[PDB]
Amino acid sequence: DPTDEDSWTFATNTKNTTSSFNVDTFYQVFDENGASGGSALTLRTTLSSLMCEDNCVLTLDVDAQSSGTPVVT
Amino acid sequence: VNNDTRNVDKNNAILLVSNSTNSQAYVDLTNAVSDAVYGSTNTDSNVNIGFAMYFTGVGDLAAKEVIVMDFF
């Protein structure tokens, strides 16, 4: 959006090994002022067709050593 | 062939990938695959190997298609 601020809600958990779960990017889940900005819709099956050269996905791994103490919350 | 047609081979299928949403994947094979590779008492040279594919949403095929899948 060129006129308003854009909010993007992610799913960055890389180690969620559930088969039905997949890393995805979402647009305007929350309004820019903190309120609800609408429903969340899948985009990962699309980001290949939207000229994203590996620059539209955020992945987070809280514990790189799996020590049982997540660094980042 | 099919199981209901002939019973020459006791087992002829070893699943590796099941309904993956990503065409690009570098997955670690489970110990079951390794066990099944050595899980037959028949002569290894007397049995051939085949690779199978099942997919959906491919109702259009181009002139040239590329298939790359190796073992590490």
From TrEMBL, chain A:
<protein>
    <submittedName>
        <fullName>Uncharacterized protein</fullName>
    </submittedName>
</protein>
<feature type="disulfide bond">
    <location>
        <begin position="52"/>
        <end position="56"/>
    </location>
</feature>
